[PDB]
């Protein structure tokens, strides 16, 4: 609508860059799900009979 007069640019703009803090893996722990050797960070398929797999044994 209106128009800003003096544009400080420096300072002000920089401060408004804290709210965008580095969102490191936005999720819970979901660490090693046992016998995974690694597995993705966020929760994933559990361990049991071949499930979710396109092919079977």
């Amino acid at each position: 609508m209106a128009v800003p007069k003096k544009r400080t640019s420096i300072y002000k703009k920089r401060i408004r860059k804290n709210i965008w803090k580095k969102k490191g893996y936005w999720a819970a722990l979901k660490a090693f799900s046992l016998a995974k050797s690694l597995s993705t960070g966020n929760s994933k398929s559990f361990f049991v009979r071949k499930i979710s797999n396109q092919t079977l044994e």
């Binding site: 993705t40 966020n42 994933k44 398929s45």
Partner: protein, 116 residues
């Protein structure tokens, strides 16, 4: 939030909901696993289990109205003689959901629906 809200109306008109749902339904009892958003998963969840309980009762009363949902005359007979009879001992829990890795290029949600 709507005091006592249930079943998302998505971002499309009502008639647009009872149309897309008809897809994820048959495709679920015809293949097995269907990928979709977390919202759709929760939505289709009931629309599927409520269609299974109908077959459990058999008769024709649960077939005329049922046809009103799905159109495929192939997946209909299924429920009336296939997997529902397998849950004849299990009260509920006909469907099962699970979250997975985010979309490809898109944020979220993502989940795979499959019969227990």
């Amino acid at each position: 939030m709507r005091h006592g809200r249930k079943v998302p109306k998505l971002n499309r008109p009502p008639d647009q909901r009872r149309a897309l749902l008809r897809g994820l339904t048959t495709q679920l009892l015809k293949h097995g696993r269907i990928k979709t958003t977390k919202a759709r998963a929760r939505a289709v969840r009931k629309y599927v289990d409520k269609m299974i309980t109908m077959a459990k009762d058999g008769s024709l009363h649960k077939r005329r109205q049922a046809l009103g949902f799905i159109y495929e005359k192939q997946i209909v007979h299924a429920l009336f003689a296939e997997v529902p009879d397998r849950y004849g001992e299990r009260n509920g829990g006909y469907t099962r959901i699970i979250r997975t890795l985010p979309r490809r290029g898109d944020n979220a949600p993502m989940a795979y629906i499959e019969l227990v």
